[PDB]
Amino acid sequence: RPCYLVLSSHDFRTPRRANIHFITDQLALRGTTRFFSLRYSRLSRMKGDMRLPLDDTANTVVSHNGVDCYLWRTTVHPFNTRRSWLRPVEDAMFRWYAAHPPKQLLDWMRESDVIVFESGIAVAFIELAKRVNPAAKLVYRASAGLSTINVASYIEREFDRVAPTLDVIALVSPAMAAEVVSRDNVFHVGHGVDHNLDQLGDPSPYAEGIHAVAVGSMLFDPEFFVVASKAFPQVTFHVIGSGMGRHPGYGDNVIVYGEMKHAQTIGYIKHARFGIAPYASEQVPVYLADSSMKLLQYDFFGLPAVCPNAVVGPYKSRFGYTPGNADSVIAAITQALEAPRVRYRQCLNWSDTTDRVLDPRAYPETRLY
Numbered sequence: 001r002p003c004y005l006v007l008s009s010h011d012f013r014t015p016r017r018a019n020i021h022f023i024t025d026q027l028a029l030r031g032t033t034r035f036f037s038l039r040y041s042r043l044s045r046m047k048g049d050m051r052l053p054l055d056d057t058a059n060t061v062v063s064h065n066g067v068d069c070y071l072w073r074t075t076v077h078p079f080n081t082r083r084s085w086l087r088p089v090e091d092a093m094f095r096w097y098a099a100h101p102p103k104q105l106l107d108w109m110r111e112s113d114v115i116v117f118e119s120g121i122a123v124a125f126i127e128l129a130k131r132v133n134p135a136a137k138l139v140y141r142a143s144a145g146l147s148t149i150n151v152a153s154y155i156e157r158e159f160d161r162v163a164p165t166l167d168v169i170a171l172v173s174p175a176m177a178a179e180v181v182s183r184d185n186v187f188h189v190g191h192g193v194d195h196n197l198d199q200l201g202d203p204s205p206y207a208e209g210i211h212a213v214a215v216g217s218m219l220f221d222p223e224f225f226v227v228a229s230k231a232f233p234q235v236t237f238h239v240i241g242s243g244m245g246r247h248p249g250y251g252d253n254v255i256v257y258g259e260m261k262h263a264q265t266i267g268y269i270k271h272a273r274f275g276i277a278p279y280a281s282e283q284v285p286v287y288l289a290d291s292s293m294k295l296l297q298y299d300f301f302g303l304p305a306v307c308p309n310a311v312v313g314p315y316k317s318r319f320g321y322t323p324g325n326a327d328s329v330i331a332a333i334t335q336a337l338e339a340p341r342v343r344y345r346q347c348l349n350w351s352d353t354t355d356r357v358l359d360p361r362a363y364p365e366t367r368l369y
């Protein structure tokens with residue numbers, strides 16, 4: 001039993017699990033498992049961080065589902081000011097941040113056999129991990145491209161600097177490789193799915209009729225549903241965890257649900273006629289076609305999908321539209337309604353995914369070079 005440390009600006013305790021949470025669940029099955037949460041400060045708090053409900057636990061270890069969680073709270077955290085004249089202040093703050101890890105981080109690094117750094121702020125601690133524990137296998141999990149996150153220049157330069165020294169760079173999408181300045185240690189590992197997705201998919205939340213589903217708040221475009229619901233009165237749109245309420249534009253054929261536990265979303269997904277990834281913008285990375293979690297979930301079931309053209313990507317059963325263009329929304333839906341359900345996409349479970357995250361060389365198909 002190996003001991004894992006995950007560094008991320010997620011916190012493991014926050015209710016909507018992201019990819020790193022699912023991986024972390026798998027790590028917790030394999031060995032000790034600590035999740036150290038970064039980029040959280042007093043500043044964070046006065047800006048609406050998802051982690052604020054955890055604030056009274058800050059800087060202490062809390063056990064959550066077999067994971068040791070630590071939300072690091074500093075007074076300020078370094079960030080992209082987005083003003084290129086403020087750069088040397090940024091560099092200063094990132095250097096300062098990186099130079100002042102808490103003892104708990106250092107201890108956890110020392111205790112770890114494997115340290116996973118999620119793309120983002122965690123980059124600032126890769127070198128530190130190498131110094132603290134050169135025996136630790138250093139796994140960078142690229143949930144997102146650095147440029148997409150729009151990290152400070154410091155983090156890009158630092159990532160570029162340290163990236164070759166990482167044991168594993170596990171890209172969610174090969175499309176991320178262009179901006180990763182390393183080769184021999186760069187691997188492709190999607191997105192897992194729950195090993196029991198098919199069992200979770202039964203029963204059925206839906207009565208008779210045609211049901212379409214959207215799950216998730218990422219770039220949530222209510223206007224999609226404004227148009228789609230009006231244009232398709234015979235379709236019931238199930239809008240789950242959109243991060244917002246009932247937009248006044250929604251037709252009565254839209255059902256708006258609060259955030260739903262992942263396992264419970266699945267029946268809504270499996271038994272839908274088609275799913276929707278209503279990203280409000282096409283100013284999105286090319287990799288989002290691969291990295292979108294909801295689209296992966298639809299894909300698992302072969303659920304035809306309506307999504308912006310920019311995230312259709314190299315996939316069947318995705319019908320692109322232009323956000324804000326009613327005609328294209330209607331055309332895409334019209335096609336989705338008639339698309340057959342076929343499981344085109346191979347979806348490894350989270351356990352098999354985590355295996356390849358940790359030892360991609362044992363699975364040579366993951367190699368990008």
Ligand SMILES: O=c1ccn([C@@H]2O[C@H](COP(=O)(O)OP(=O)(O)O)[C@@H](O)[C@H]2O)c(=O)[nH]1
Nearest residue numbers: 215216217218241259260262265292293294
């Ligand atoms: O109330 C919710 C909202 C989101 N999700 C899931 O959370 C993941 C991420 O959703 P988000 O929109 O934030 O990102 P995306 O899927 O579009 O990448 C997706 O698999 C959703 O299916 C969920 O289970 N319940």
